[PDB]
């Protein structure tokens, strides 16, 4: 006996592990035609075309299994499947909540649910901050604040400016006495790094500028979207303990398929839901880079890029109708089962061969064959 | 459910392909920002306009997709309208350029 809310995770994991990119719903013909489009700039049409068409078609071959799926597409597919178009739209516009340092809010809100009659889908965004890397020493006679490169710190003799990536000029505070002390303390190189125990008065002048900046990090916003993932806590049967399951892809590392094939979903679930929120909170609180990299690798990396600058965790939560979600997955497998094939691997091979025929034909219609 | 989900993911793959092609094409703009200025015009184009200027810098795919999207990608289902394609071309062009010039 298994709850319907749990069958949702079963079908979802089973379909992704077996069929991969086919779970997006994209017809193989559409996908091959497109691949031909993003590969036709690289084709010099003064050379041999059947050379390049076959080469390009063959390069996309050894890539299908390569991690070219983004965390957002996986997270979006999951929300769409478990919620349907209407509720995924409203879920997409719901505002993210910032995680508490110990995760008290997410912990507490889960406790307000009956683990046997409620099915939660949690979606997280992880944000990195991107402070400037470079300190540029320049003179007033060479510095127009509109010309200068962005996302840099600029040390003048009478000012110390920070130019963010958007264009807004910021005065970092040091008086005109302080700036000349730093200007005459730093050498002749055009650029310098804001990241690297000081020994030379050059190093002290750079480290204090880092300090003068970091005490006013408040005034800026460097944060960029870094990683996306979801978590599903289905219903339990009676006296059964609650279980969560993380879902994610990671561009460059693994797909949503690879994540399932490696059973990392099941590996992280066994550590329990609350202990997960805890290690998730430390990632947003810690300032130690080894600890921030320890957790980040354990949670969000392949089963089988040092996170130096801080990370923050935000979430939004909703409830699943397992009947709807199974119906949504049924319609998706209906599409999948329109591809000839004795078994899932046979159906994937038909998708790939079908897509390759569309990529080759679309290349030929564009290059006069 | 499935048709709406498929149309979404088909539209997403197109946007991704638009972003990759336009970006590769933007990487070779001169110091007069010709290709970028062209990209800005595109994000403000009238959706009823059925003609590009004769020696348009825009990538071949973009203009083919704009004019006859169902000839440009003859596997694309009819439930994707020419207007929907064109709205997507402008929203992608607006997002790329603002990212390219670092406002997002
Ligand atoms: Pr067979
Ligand atoms: Pr076979
Ligand atoms: Pr304009
Ligand atoms: Pr304008």
Residue numbers in the entry:
A (entry chain A): 13 to 208, 214 to 321, 331 to 395
B (entry chain C): 11 to 114
The article reads:
Strikingly, the SidE- and MavC-type enzymes, two recently identified effector families from the bacterial pathogen Legionella pneumophila, can ubiquitinate host substrates through non-canonical mechanisms without engaging any of the conventional ubiquitination machinery. The genomic cluster of MavC encodes three effector proteins: Lpg2147 (MavC itself), Lpg2148 (MavC paralog A, or MvcA), and Lpg2149. Taken together, our data show that MavC can catalyze deamidation, ubiquitination, and deubiquitination by using the same active pocket. In addition to MavC and MvcA, the same genomic cluster in L. pneumophila also encodes a small effector protein, Lpg2149, which has been shown to interact with both enzymes and inhibit their deamidation activities.
To understand the detailed molecular mechanisms of Lpg2149-mediated inhibition, we determined the crystal structures of MavC–Lpg2149 and MvcA–Lpg2149 complexes (X-ray statistics in Table 1). The asymmetric unit contains one Lpg2149 and one enzyme for both structures, highlighting a 1:1 molar ratio of the complex formation. Both structures adopt a similar assembly, with the Lpg2149 monomer binding to the connecting region between Catalytic and HBD domains. Lpg2149 forms similar and extensive hydrogen bonding and hydrophobic interactions with MavC and MvcA, which are mainly mediated by the N-terminal α-helix (aa 11–37) and a helix-loop motif (aa 74–86) of Lpg2149. Upon binding to the enzymes, this C-terminal α-helix folds back and occupies the groove of the very same Lpg2149 molecule. Isothermal titration calorimetry (ITC) experiments confirm that the binding of Lpg2149–MavC (~0.57 nM) is ~50-fold stronger than that of Lpg2149–MvcA (~28.08 nM). On the other hand, the same set of Lpg2149 mutants show considerable reductions for the inhibition of MvcA-mediated Ub deamidation. Although MvcA shares a high degree of similarity with MavC and possesses Ub-deamidase activity, it cannot catalyze UBE2N ubiquitination.
